[PDB]
């Protein structure tokens, strides 16, 4: 007794472990735990593929579960490591199952850089192995029937998921064995054979002839359609074709023999004979043309016995007329069977080794959220500094707030005195002088490292080239040159960063020495500074003039505005929203993540409160400045211009310009310092990447 099954596909073994490990690490903090269980698992994945595929050997649900275990893992991994972003050189290689192509060869292989191909083949192998476990079952037994019926339905379904999967996944022309048509015929053969089994159960349980006829008819339909699909495409092993033919016929004959007992029960004797006669024919033909592939004797003996007896009873007793087949009513059909849908996990006891790993669909979303947060926050900071710079400059250019706290021309206007004591407290000129002094040294410290590093590479290369020169035979590894170009290109990059930093140092030095002398003035004790400021007679009617109080309250409010920018910049900076979860959600509930629109709305709930105010700050400045210059220009027409207060005037404006510069310089200087300090960090790692690669090589 003989059922069709499919042979597995052969693969060459590949290293899964290590092209995955490259991404794993280049994505996570090297040496941490979020990488510990991700290299331990990737090796256990490479192991698993080996046991799943590495040998066409084992032949039970020991080895099937291993394959199913493998399919489930291979599917769980696709939404991680960027497969859908072709850069991983994991190339999978399978051979046709049947030794088939669309040319007259004797085998054909196909290697592809796609997980989609990998998974189509594994499933085909899951289906084929299932087909083999099913065809082996002892069908006299209830566990036998149950297991055949379940595996055939599994196989049919696995083959059909392939039919619907292949072309969209695999971006090439597949081998014949996994093409839609082949795999669609295989699916139907498996479905047919599942019916066959349900027919055999019903027979064994002695169910009604009505039921049995209909199950057999249905099997016959299924084998027929499969036969037809085979008739003009020879893409299956040569034995599939005759065997479908015989099974179709046997199924028809089984259908008729049962329908014929039913007719005898209803006393349609001519009919019984007509159906018996058709069964005898089908079996006669089967026995003689498909002997090789079937045994049909018992059935044939039983048909003949029924036929002789029915003809005896008829010829002598009943005298019923025997109809032509065309006038017989169709036997009905009953399927009891379905293609099993494929829904991972298809394996018992499944656990996703890499469950913890975050989907790439999120990484890209999470990293691209940052570059929109950054763009929003920096943008807003910059606008605000650019505005404060401009206001302070305009104020200076109009001697404000100095001019209105300037009772006589005799003392240090309160504001200047505040700014002075402010300068003196922050350390005065020493704090700017000491930061200028150490800047060439932080530059030099970073040059040292870049150079010590590349010279390592140079020295090692000089000798590798000499060893190749003098020991041709004994010394052959890829030259240092090639191994080193990646590092050396980081090298020339760093160089560019240094050249920009030097230019930046240039701007700060020139500014610093362009503004030193005045700053030094501002830092003097109160009377010493008062002596150095020229005195003037005041324009005395500045008692309580309306232009003065207006300017005053307007300055109080411009002040207000700029002191508020500090707490804005701090709230802009001190908050953030972790977005992972929002993406995780949008991925689980919906199909994909669209961060574009999902971030724009969250950036608005998080930052909108502050971005609103930042804009309200600028317009409020523009407002306050427009009607301060008009209010000033009128103020000046009230306080005349002579030499003694022009002199006081410039010194005053220049002392205010001096305050701005000190504050700005400290900030540029500290920025330079921080930069040169973070840069040493980056360059020490680079120094070690260099020495490690000279110590390995």
């Amino acid at each position: 007794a003989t059922f069709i099954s499919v042979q597995l596909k052969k693969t060459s073994e590949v290293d899964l472990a290590k092209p995955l490990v490259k991404f794993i690490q280049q994505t996570y903090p090297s040496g941490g735990e979020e990488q510990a269980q991700y290299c331990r698992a990737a090796e256990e994945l490479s192991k698993l593929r080996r046991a799943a595929v590495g040998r066409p050997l084992d032949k039970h649900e020991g080895a099937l579960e291993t394959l199913l275990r493998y399919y489930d893992q291979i599917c769980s991994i696709e939404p991680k490591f960027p497969f859908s972003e072709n850069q991983i050189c994991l190339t999978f290689t399978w051979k046709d199952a049947f030794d088939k192509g669309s040319l007259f060869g004797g085998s054909v292989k196909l290697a592809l850089a796609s997980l989609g191909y990998e998974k189509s083949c594994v499933l085909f192998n899951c289906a084929a192995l299932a087909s083999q476990i099913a065809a082996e079952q002892n069908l006299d037994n209830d566990e036998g029937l149950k297991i055949a019926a379940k595996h055939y339905q599994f196989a049919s379904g696995a083959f059909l998921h392939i039919k619907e999967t292949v072309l969209s996944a695999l971006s090439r022309e597949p081998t014949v064995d996994i093409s839609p048509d082949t795999v669609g015929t295989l699916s139907l053969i498996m479905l047919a054979q599942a019916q066959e089994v349900f027919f055999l159960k019903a027979t064994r349980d002695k169910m009604k002839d009505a039921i049995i006829a209909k199950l057999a008819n249905q099997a016959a339909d299924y084998f027929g359609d499969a036969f037809k699909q085979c008739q003009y495409k020879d893409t299956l092993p040569k034995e599939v074709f005759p065997v479908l033919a015989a099974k179709h016929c046997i199924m028809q004959a089984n259908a008729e023999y049962h329908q014929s007992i039913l007719a005898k029960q209803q006393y349609y004797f001519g009919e019984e004979i007509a159906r018996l006669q058709h069964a005898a024919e089908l079996i006669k033909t089967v026995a003689s043309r498909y002997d090789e592939y079937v045994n049909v004797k018992d059935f044939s003996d039983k048909i003949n016995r029924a036929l002789a007896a029915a003809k005896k009873d008829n010829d002598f007793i009943y005298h019923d007329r025997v109809p032509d087949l065309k006038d017989l009513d169709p036997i009905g059909k009953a399927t009891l069977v379905k293609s099993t849908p494929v829904n991972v996990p298809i394996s018992q006891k499944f656990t996703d080794l890499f469950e913890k790993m975050v989907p790439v669909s999120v990484q890209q979303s999470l990293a691209a959220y940052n570059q929109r947060k950054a763009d929003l926050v920096n943008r807003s900071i910059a606008q605000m500094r650019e505005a404060t710079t401009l206001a302070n400059g305009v104020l200076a250019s109009l001697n404000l707030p100095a001019a209105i706290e300037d009772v006589s021309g005799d003392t240090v206007p309160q504001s200047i005195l505040t700014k002075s004591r402010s300068v003196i407290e922050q350390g005065g000129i020493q704090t700017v002088d000491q930061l200028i002094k150490e800047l060439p040294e932080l530059l030099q410290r970073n040059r040292e490292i870049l150079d010590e590093s590349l010279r390592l590479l140079d020295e090692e290369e000089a000798t590798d080239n000499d060893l190749r020169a003098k020991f041709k035979e004994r010394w052959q590894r890829t030259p240092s040159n090639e191994l080193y170009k990646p590092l050396r290109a980081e090298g020339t990059n760093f160089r560019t960063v240094l050249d920009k930093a030097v230019q930046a140092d240039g701007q700060v030095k020139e500014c610093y020495q362009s503004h030193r002398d005045t700053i030094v003035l501002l830092c003097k004790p109160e009377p010493e500074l008062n002596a150095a400021i020229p005195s003037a007679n005041p324009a005395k009617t500045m008692q309580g003039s309306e232009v003065v109080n207006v300017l005053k309250s307007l300055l109080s409010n411009l002040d207000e505005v700029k002191k508020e920018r500090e707490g804005l910049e701090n709230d802009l900076k001190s908050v953030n929203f972790d977005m992972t979860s929002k993406f995780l959600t949008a991925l689980a509930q919906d199909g994909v993540i669209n961060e574009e629109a999902l971030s724009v709305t969250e950036l608005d709930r998080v930052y909108g409160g502050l971005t609103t105010k930042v804009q309200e700050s600028l317009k409020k400045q523009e407002g306050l400045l427009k009607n301060i210059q008009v209010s000033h220009q009128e103020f000046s027409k009230m306080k005349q211009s002579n030499n003694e207060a022009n002199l006081r005037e410039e010194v005053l404006k220049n002392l205010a310009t001096a305050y701005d510069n000190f504050v700005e310089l400290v900030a540029n200087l500290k920025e330079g310092t921080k930069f040169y300090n973070e840069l040493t960090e980056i360059l020490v790692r680079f120094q070690n990447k260099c020495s490690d690669i000279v110590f390995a090589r």
């Binding site: 560019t496 960063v497 920009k500 930093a501 700060v508 920025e671 330079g672 930069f675 980056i682």
Partner: peptide
């Protein structure tokens, strides 16, 4: 932009 903290932080 004064000192290149752009180039710096990406590396």
């Amino acid at each position: 932009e004064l000192y290149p903290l752009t180039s710096l932080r990406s590396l």
